[PDB]
Point group: C2
Chain length 124, copies 2
């Protein structure tokens, strides 16, 4: 869900508060987006937006209110590693990764703080 | 999901293997049921069958393949206590309890082993 995504950003980046740092950053990090990601760390976010985009299409899945952010799926973090349980059904397994790939991706991309709280519908 | 239900039966009854002991027991414990529960520990199972029965009706919920046993929902067991996270969405929150009430209920009901592997479609 939302709280696990964050909790996976800590797992991978034990140097944060993934609420402060990556929520409202550049064009796609945070809810929504438009324009071209302004960075690689924006790209991570853009791509994860598609990860969820795509999920909504699996006709096998029917996520609540229609925001996969609402899907609880059990994973476990250990030694800065992000594993994804397999007892996990297919819809939550899709999210697990949508969420796990960002956490990975993020830990490996330059954080320009000059893109945190960007003028969204302006420089987008 | 299935693996958490079990994992909650340990939480509440640290004296088991909730696979062996309560799967295939009396008429409702296990998959399906017919007849009147043969016991109180059968009643726990019957009632949980309705708990899931009911869940399928919440038009807000749409469970995979249509067996709420397939719903992962995060809970945490501590000091023989079964808590149910609230970061949990409403459909998985319904299951959490359907599952938590059995675990409670079970720990408090006489286990006749003379009902384990009962002639289902015979004494039902
Ligand atoms: Ca986004
Ligand atoms: Ca779930
Ligand atoms: Ca049953």
């Amino acid at each position: 869900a939302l709280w696990q995504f964050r909790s996976m950003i800590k797992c991978a980046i034990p140097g944060s508060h993934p609420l402060m740092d990556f929520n409202n950053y550049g064009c796609y990090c945070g809810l929504g987006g438009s324009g071209t990601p302004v960075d690689e760390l924006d790209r991570c976010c853009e791509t994860h937006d598609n990860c969820y985009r795509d999920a909504k299409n699996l006709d096998s899945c029917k996520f609540l209110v229609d925001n996969p952010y609402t899907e609880s799926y059990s994973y476990s973090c250990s030694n800065t590693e992000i594993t994804c349980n397999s007892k996990n059904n297919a819809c939550e397994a899709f999210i697990c990764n949508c969420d796990r790939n960002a956490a990975i991706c993020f830990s490996k991309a330059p954080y320009n703080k000059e893109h945190k709280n960007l003028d969204t519908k302006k420089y987008c």
